[PDB]
Design a protein around this ligand. Structure first.
Ligand SMILES: NS(=O)(=O)c1c(F)c(F)c(SCCO)c(F)c1N[C@H]1CCc2ccccc21
Ligand code: NA
Ligand SMILES: [Zn+2]
Length: 257
């Protein structure tokens, strides 16, 4: 099946998922000089006060923290969005080395990891309907750089040894995603796609300008996870990022400067 290795990694995905070569694929390199400042873009509204995290799961590609999205408890709106989007899950992509790991790049610079908070447009009623729509998802992307620890990340890092292998899950209640945000909500935005198969072109991407900093020990703990299931040979879960895709007929808009 698809993955991140030599024989099934991103350069192979188009054979099963032809939209891999589509018109609005993600991620992309953000050229900060050519992003258009749009003064009509609104501040982002991140309303995470009533978030209910449920569980954390190793799916063999990354780990996901899942939320109760059956009511408007943790929503994203404003910014470039017209609707209300509900938080369903977050996950990360990261590298084998601190110099790589993010999906988006900024002037060709890679970060050590990238957090994706995935939300779906509540006019479509559920996540599965939303992914079939050009405006169905809004994914808030936050870069991680290695420096000082992120205290709000530590509850995540601490539970990872309990979901080491493909298919494992653990209860993960009372996790507050506001702990993962940087100080500024200035952002870039562009229309794009999921960054794994099925690569559907249903995403409004909102990528925060300001990274969060995490410690070397925090990111090292991510690289101890495994892509394989228990009692299969060990394949460390590292480098689970898709490279930048061509921007094609798209413009990245900036909410700042
Ligand atoms: N960067 S992303 O938002 O495209 C993404 C990833 F890159 C992931 F690696 C994963 S791990 C599960 C893969 O099947 C994601 F869930 C999601 N997001 C979820 C969003 C729900 C969904 C549906 C189909 C595929 C992926 C996803
Ligand atoms: Na350190
Ligand atoms: Zn992602």
């Amino acid at each position: 099946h698809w993955g991140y290795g030599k024989h099934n990694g991103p350069e192979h995905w188009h054979k099963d998922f032809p939209i891999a070569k589509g018109e609005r694929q993600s991620p992309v390199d953000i050229d900060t000089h050519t992003a258009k400042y749009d003064p009509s873009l609104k501040p982002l509204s991140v309303s995470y006060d009533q978030a209910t995290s449920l569980r954390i799961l190793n799916n063999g590609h990354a780990f996901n923290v899942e939320f109760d999205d059956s009511q408007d408890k943790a929503v994203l709106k404003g910014g470039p969005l017209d609707g209300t989007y509900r938080l369903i899950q977050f996950h990360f992509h990261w590298g084998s080395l601190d110099g790589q790991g993010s999906e988006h790049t900024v002037d060709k610079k890679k970060y050590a990891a990238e957090l994706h908070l995935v939300h779906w447009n509540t006019k479509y009623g559920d996540f599965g309907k939303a992914v079939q729509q050009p405006d169905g998802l809004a994914v808030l992307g936050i870069f991680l750089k290695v420096g000082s620890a992120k205290p709000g990340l530590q509850k995540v890092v601490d539970v990872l040894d309990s979901i080491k292998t493909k298919g494992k899950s653990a209860d993960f209640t009372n996790f507050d995603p506001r702990g993962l945000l940087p100080e500024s909500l200035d952002y870039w935005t562009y229309p794009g796609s999921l960054t794994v198969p099925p690569l559907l072109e249903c995403v409004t991407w909102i990528v925060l300008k300001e990274p969060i900093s995490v410690s070397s020990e925090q990111v090292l703990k991510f690289r101890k996870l495994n892509f394989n299931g228990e009692g299969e040979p060990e394949e460390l879960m590292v480098d689970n990022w898709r490279p930048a895709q061509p921007l094609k007929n798209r413009q990245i808009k900036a909410s700042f400067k």
